[PDB]
Ligand binder design. Structure first.
Ligand code: CA
Ligand code: CA
Ligand code: CL
Ligand code: CL
Ligand code: CL
Ligand code: CL
Lengths: 229, 228
């Protein structure tokens, strides 16, 4: 289990759409203690997004089936299956959050890295919050918001408005306001100013990042249109 | 634990796209030893299709990367990952095949079901063949051919040419000839006669099953024009 070997295996697993393997590879890479490159960071991020994503997708289907059933035998099955999916989901989120606290955030030598990992921390507490019961929830929601907020402040100070990480943070942070806090108003103003400040930046883009930035801008505006129908 | 409870859990799993769970539920329903209903047969089939298919899809990507490279370190990674994927795939195929042999084929009391399960046996031996490389291959290819052939004999005798299972068998058997046995002429002949016989007997088409039948006919002809 060499660093290059594990990264190469992670890229193979990605092409094979075998995301558990991919996450396992990048988990052990992260655990070697060294600061991840841009490439590795993205591989870790993509792997766990897919690993949690599958459970989040399943959770929403099973949860909706539980809510649409009017007897006790069928509901208790949907309920028990939701709870099985929930524990898998929490195990995965806590894996990622542990990696973030122990290795990734401490070793982040640049503002880019810092913001990226703090956004990631916000995301995985937000996924725990989607699934929270209510007592633990308020504490989960505050962790998410603190992570996003610290990231938001570093991004404003240290990155241009058209930077894909800054735009991506705005998108996710706005989704957090809408879906976790239930504030359409805060979600809209966050998304709007991110879009408008990016539109205003004149030739701030570069040949590498322009495709991702303009795509996230489109996703910001899509949310604005949806949220004021 | 209860048959109906396992089937309901399988339907939940399907909606959740959690196909290993779906496959586990329907496997244990099969193991209870009673002849499966049509709904249960289809749930088993869909479940394992997706379980084995993910491995097949992964296998093809990792084979393609192995072939498209000549770096010594990178080729050895791909090969060992292909082999990991292959033993997963073989274990899935062997679970399905043992269910077919022990429970599904012996209990099938209608020609429709017998043809379905023999076709299924053909399919899963074919998936073993796709991965077979050693001297094991000829034996596996033969196993696949005999299952398909027995299914073919029964369907021809007992089922109408428009019946979706008859048509479905013709599609899969033609694919076997083309992809496993490298025999495009036999593949085209099988597909063409199945298409033509169905066209000739459009009188004997059911309102419940015509959509499936005409879709499969379209696939048979798509292969004819592709293979031409
Ligand atoms: Ca997987
Ligand atoms: Ca699964
Ligand atoms: Cl995997
Ligand atoms: Cl996966
Ligand atoms: Cl599953
Ligand atoms: Cl699955």
């Amino acid at each position: 289990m060499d660093k290059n070997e594990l990264v190469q295996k992670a890229k193979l697993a990605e092409q094979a759409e075998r995301y558990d393997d991919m996450a396992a590879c990048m988990k052990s890479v992260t655990e070697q203690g060294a600061e991840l490159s841009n490439e590795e960071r993205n591989l870790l991020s993509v792997a766990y997004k897919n690993v949690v994503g599958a459970r989040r997708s399943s959770w929403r289907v099973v949860s909706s089936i539980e809510q649409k059933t009017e007897a006790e035998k069928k509901q208790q099955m949907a309920r028990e299956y939701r709870e099985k999916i929930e524990t898998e989901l929490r195990d995965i989120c806590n894996d990622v959050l542990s990696l973030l606290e122990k290795f990734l955030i401490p070793n982040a030598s640049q503002a880019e890295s810092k913001v990226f990992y703090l956004k990631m921390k916000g995301d995985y507490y937000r996924y725990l919050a989607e699934v929270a019961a209510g007592d633990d929830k308020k504490g989960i929601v505050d962790q998410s918001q603190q992570a996003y907020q610290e990231a938001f402040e570093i991004s404003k100070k240290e990155m241009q408005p058209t930077h894909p990480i800054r735009l991506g943070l705005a998108l996710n942070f706005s989704v957090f306001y809408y879906e976790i806090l239930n504030s359409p108003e805060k979600a809209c103003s966050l998304a709007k100013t991110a879009f408008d400040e990016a539109i205003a930046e004149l030739d701030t883009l570069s040949e590498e990042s322009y495709k991702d930035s303009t795509l996230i801008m489109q996703l910001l505006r899509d949310n604005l249109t949806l949220w004021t129908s």
